[PDB]
DNA sequence: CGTCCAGTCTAC
DNA sequence: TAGACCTGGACGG
């Protein structure tokens, strides 16, 4: 997922778990090389928030829950196939690698972190990744200042299409979003990052870094993805103007990732 | 059957 | 930097 997917996943956990009570331990698949979550409670609520391409779960025991336990926070990154689902306990999807189980009363459901390719990761801390910049969705003004303060950084030597993936400055921006963002401004993907950014110091490249992914969120649905029908997925394919679309050029950036664009590749093209 | 394609993380 | 980390769907023979 990218920021919209991480953001919509957090909204999903919050709405789906609002009137649910979990109990017991936090179960991990045998094959997952991520850490065992040391946590047990007779009764606890799960909530979420999203920051860029990371999602924080808070496991929050109720008054009187046993064993005695302070709230616990997990941060997740999704890599290529991470996701959250609420399923019936005996119908776990195949790659459900971490699982929170409802307590009686009611239907026994499982909140599952599902990650086919297992590029996703979680940490016990609860801290955001040091070095990741502010959320382009929820921290726009902080994100905007963080780029304009640091144009001197060597990151901005690189072509614009590569800089937009550097999560130190564009936390939340991934492959589809960089294509869609540059297509909106007809900015060649291999223009130099510093060149396009120095200008700003209406809608400019940094503003679109916020407004474009906000468009994905306001589709409702589950971004690139279909957790709420194939209808929501068709809604997304329709929103796209550039990424994967017929009549568009594509190249490889210096890290082998496909950038989609119209017309001028730009000066720093391979 | 085979190939190729879809975000970090870490060892050169 | 370049390869490593993974599974599965869409192709081509």
UniProtKB/Swiss-Prot annotation:
Molecular function, one GO term: hydrolase activity, acting on glycosyl bonds
Effect of residue 257 to A: Strongly reduced glycosylase activity. Has little effect on AP lyase activity
Impact when changing residue 53 to L: Loss of glycosylase activity
Residues annotated to bind DNA: 175
Outcome, altering residue 155 to T: Found in a patient with childhood-onset steroid-resistant nephrotic syndrome; uncertain significance
Stretches that traverse the bilayer: none
Cellular component terms per the entry's GO annotation: centrosome; chromosome; cytoplasm; cytosol; nucleoplasm; nucleus
Keyword terms: Chromosome, Cytoplasm, Cytoskeleton, DNA damage, DNA repair, DNA-binding, Glycosidase, Hydrolase, Lyase, Multifunctional enzyme, Nucleus
Catalytic activity of the protein: 2'-deoxyribonucleotide-(2'-deoxyribose 5'-phosphate)-2'-deoxyribonucleotide-DNA = a 3'-end 2'-deoxyribonucleotide-(2,3-dehydro-2,3-deoxyribose 5'-phosphate)-DNA + a 5'-end 5'-phospho-2'-deoxyribonucleoside-DNA + H(+)
UniProt keyword DNA damage present: yes
Residues annotated as the enzyme's active site: 1 (schiff-base intermediate with dna), 2 (proton donor), 53 (proton donor)
Induction per the UniProt record: Up-regulated during S-phase.
Lineage top rank: taxon: Eukaryota
EC number: 3.2.2.-, 4.2.99.18
Tissue spec. comment: Ubiquitous.
GO biological process, alphabetically ordered: base-excision repair; base-excision repair, gap-filling; depyrimidination; negative regulation of nuclease activity; response to oxidative stress
Protein's cellular compartments: Cytoplasm, Cytoskeleton, Microtubule organizing center, Centrosome; Nucleus; Chromosome
Functional note: Involved in base excision repair of DNA damaged by oxidation or by mutagenic agents. Acts as a DNA glycosylase that recognizes and removes damaged bases. Has a preference for oxidized pyrimidines, such as thymine glycol, formamidopyrimidine (Fapy) and 5-hydroxyuracil. Has marginal activity towards 8-oxoguanine. Has AP (apurinic/apyrimidinic) lyase activity and introduces nicks in the DNA strand. Cleaves the DNA backbone by beta-delta elimination to generate a single-strand break at the site of the removed base with both 3'- and 5'-phosphates.
Protein family membership: Belongs to the FPG family.
Protein name: Endonuclease 8-like 1
């Amino acid at each position: 997922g990218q920021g919209p997917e991480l953001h919509l996943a957090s909204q999903f956990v919050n709405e789906a778990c609002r009137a649910l009570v979990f109990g017991g331990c936090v179960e991990k698949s045998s094959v997952s090389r991520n850490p065992e979550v040391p946590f047990e409670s007779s009764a606890y609520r799960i909530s979420a928030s999203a920051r860029g391409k990371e999602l924080r779960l808070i496991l929050s025991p109720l008054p009187g829950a046993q064993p005695q336990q302070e709230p616990l926070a997990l941060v997740f990154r999704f890599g290529m196939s991470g996701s959250f689902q609420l399923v019936p306990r005996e119908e776990l999807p195949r790659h459900a690698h971490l699982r929170f189980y409802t307590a009686p009363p009611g239907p026994r459901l499982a909140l599952c972190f599902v990650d086919i390719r297992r590029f996703g990761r979680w940490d016990l801390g609860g801290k955001w990744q040091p070095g990741r910049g502010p959320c382009v969705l929820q921290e726009y003004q902080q994100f905007r200042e963080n780029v304009l303060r640091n144009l001197a950084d060597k990151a901005f030597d690189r072509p614009i299409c590569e800089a937009l993936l550097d999560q130190r400055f564009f936390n939340g921006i991934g492959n589809y979003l960089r294509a869609e963002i540059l297509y909106r401004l007809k900015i060649p993907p291999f223009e130099k990052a510093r060149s396009v950014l120095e200008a700003l110091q209406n809608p400019d490249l940094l503003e679109l870094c916020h407004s474009v992914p906000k468009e994905v969120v306001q589709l409702g649905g589950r971004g690139y993805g279909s957790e709420s029908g194939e209808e929501d997925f068709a809604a997304f394919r329709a929103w796209l103007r550039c990424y994967g679309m017929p009549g568009m050029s594509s190249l490889q950036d210096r890290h082998g990732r496909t950038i989609w664009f119209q017309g001028d590749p730009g000066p720093l093209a391979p």
